Amino acid sequence: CPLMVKVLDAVRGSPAINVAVHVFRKAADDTWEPFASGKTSESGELHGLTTEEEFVEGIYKVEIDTKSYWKALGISPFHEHAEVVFTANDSGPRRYTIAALLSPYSYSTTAVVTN
Amino acid sequence: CPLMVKVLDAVRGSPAINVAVHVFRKAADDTWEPFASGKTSESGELHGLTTEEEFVEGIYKVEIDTKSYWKALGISPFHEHAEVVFTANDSGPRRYTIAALLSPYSYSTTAVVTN
Amino acid sequence: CPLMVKVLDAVRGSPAINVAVHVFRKAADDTWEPFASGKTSESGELHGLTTEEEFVEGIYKVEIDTKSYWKALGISPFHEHAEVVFTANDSGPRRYTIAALLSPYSYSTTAVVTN
Amino acid sequence: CPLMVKVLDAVRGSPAINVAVHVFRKAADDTWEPFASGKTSESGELHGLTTEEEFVEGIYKVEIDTKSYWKALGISPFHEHAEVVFTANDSGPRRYTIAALLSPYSYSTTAVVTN
Ligand SMILES: [Ca+2]
Ligand SMILES: [Ca+2]
Ligand SMILES: [Ca+2]
Ligand SMILES: [Ca+2]
Ligand SMILES: [Ca+2]
Numbered sequence: 001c002p003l004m005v006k007v008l009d010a011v012r013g014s015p016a017i018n019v020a021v022h023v024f025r026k027a028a029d030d031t032w033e034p035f036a037s038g039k040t041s042e043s044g045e046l047h048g049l050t051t052e053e054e055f056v057e058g059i060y061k062v063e064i065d066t067k068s069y070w071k072a073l074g075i076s077p078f079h080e081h082a083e084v085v086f087t088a089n090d091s092g093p094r095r096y097t098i099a100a101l102l103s104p105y106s107y108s109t110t111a112v113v114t115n
Numbered sequence: 116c117p118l119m120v121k122v123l124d125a126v127r128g129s130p131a132i133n134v135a136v137h138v139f140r141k142a143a144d145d146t147w148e149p150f151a152s153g154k155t156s157e158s159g160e161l162h163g164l165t166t167e168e169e170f171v172e173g174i175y176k177v178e179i180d181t182k183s184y185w186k187a188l189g190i191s192p193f194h195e196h197a198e199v200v201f202t203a204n205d206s207g208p209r210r211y212t213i214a215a216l217l218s219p220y221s222y223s224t225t226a227v228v229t230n
Numbered sequence: 231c232p233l234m235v236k237v238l239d240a241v242r243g244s245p246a247i248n249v250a251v252h253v254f255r256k257a258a259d260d261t262w263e264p265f266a267s268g269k270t271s272e273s274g275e276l277h278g279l280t281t282e283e284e285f286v287e288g289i290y291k292v293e294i295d296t297k298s299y300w301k302a303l304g305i306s307p308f309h310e311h312a313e314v315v316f317t318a319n320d321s322g323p324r325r326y327t328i329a330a331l332l333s334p335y336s337y338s339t340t341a342v343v344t345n
Numbered sequence: 346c347p348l349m350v351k352v353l354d355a356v357r358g359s360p361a362i363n364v365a366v367h368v369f370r371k372a373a374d375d376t377w378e379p380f381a382s383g384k385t386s387e388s389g390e391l392h393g394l395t396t397e398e399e400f401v402e403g404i405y406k407v408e409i410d411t412k413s414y415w416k417a418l419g420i421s422p423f424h425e426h427a428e429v430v431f432t433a434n435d436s437g438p439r440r441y442t443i444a445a446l447l448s449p450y451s452y453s454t455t456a457v458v459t460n
């Protein structure tokens with residue numbers, strides 16, 4: 001995987017399972033083209049979004065449907081979603097892990113970029 | 116302030132000063148309309164973005180220009196920006212503090228909502 | 231204040247009110263001596279712990295009783311407490327804000343140090 | 346592994362490698378008994394600290410030498426270390442992952458507790 005998404009639940013201390021994730025690529029006309037999507041697994045991970053052939057340089061947006069996740073647990077969330085926007089591969093393909101730690105009124109996101 | 120933004124630098128343990136912040140409100144046609152903008156002060160806070168009359172119900176997006184902040188410090192950060200999207204004032208007028216804590220490859224954002 | 235502690239609740243998006251906080255300073259014999267204590271106010275802040283005369287160089291430990299906080303809300307949290315340990319005033323007198331952001335299975339802590 | 350530690354670097358966007366980690370168990374006389382230790386691998390993970398035979402109920406402290414890690418990178422850290430203190434297995438053995446996300450003036454820690 002050149003791009004992996006991992007989501008954690010800070011209220012329950014568990015992976016965040018069945019979280020919808022959409023990935024977009026910035027088109028030339030500055031709009032967001034859908035690129036890939038899925039739902040986090042039981043380990044809160046989403047693999048196989050793209051291939052390194054397809055994952056070329058550009059600006060990508062990862063949208064995490066945090067609101068539906070909290071709605072499903074019966075907990076009021078603040079955010080509509082969590083967005084992560086970044087420029088990829090600007091020094092060559094590496095592997096990207098986008099981690100997100102979710103609370104109802106707070107989230108953090110971290111990129112782990114390795115060889 | 117019905118809406119205040121506060122940004123901290125986790126590398127230096129300081130307010131993040133002169134960070135540009137753009138606020139948008141989602142219109143009837145589902146486009147983002149520019150709502151307010153400003154920059155954080157020496158305390159890392161941005162006050163006076165709006166008024167309670169102007170700050171009606173809606174979906175708002177606060178876009179914090181973290182990239183320019185890190186670049187001006189010689190750092191090439193992961194994220195293009197930190198975006199915070201939320202429904203405001205749905206159950207009546209509230210006061211919102213949007214906090215952001217910045218690291219070059221990570222950020223967190225927290226909402227404090229008071230009545 | 232040379233030393234202020236501020237605690238937020240990430241589940242409710244509010245200050246964390248009435249949170250007990252104990253401060254210790256490491257003595258010559260490497261034991262922790264009680265230094266100051268208090269509880270967070272309605273704003274989630276604890277002021278007036280010490281004075282600049284009393285707040286000499288040393289290693290300090292701020293222990294935030296997060297467990298009692300969550301328990302009183304019916305939540306069984308992961309952590310016994312959040313402990314923050316740091317050398318203070320090594321290059322001269324500074325003002326320290328120790329922020330903590332609390333979730334039942336996660337917390338973050340940030341220092342803001344100003345001169 | 347009934348207990349695993351994972352450390353990430355929020356400045357470099359990478360696992361935090363060669364971070365010293367000590368695990369303690371609270372003795373009957375309220376002092377901390379060393380229990381296990383190691384250094385994070387190239388993936389920022391530390392496995393094989395204990396066995397489920399040995400990892401009985403009790404209060405455990407995980408001390409992460411964040412200060413040496415930042416010193417090794419030539420970056421001034423605020424904290425002496427990061428401590429995580431928690432009661433284990435209080436409803437039966439599960440698997441514990443203690444994750445820590447490190448910045449020079451800020452850290453977060455999260456417990457991922459699974460079956
Ligand atoms: Ca993968
Ligand atoms: Ca204000
Ligand atoms: Ca309404
Ligand atoms: Ca004060
Ligand atoms: Ca000194």
Ligand SMILES: [Ca+2]
Binds near residue numbers: 349
């Ligand atoms: Ca393991």
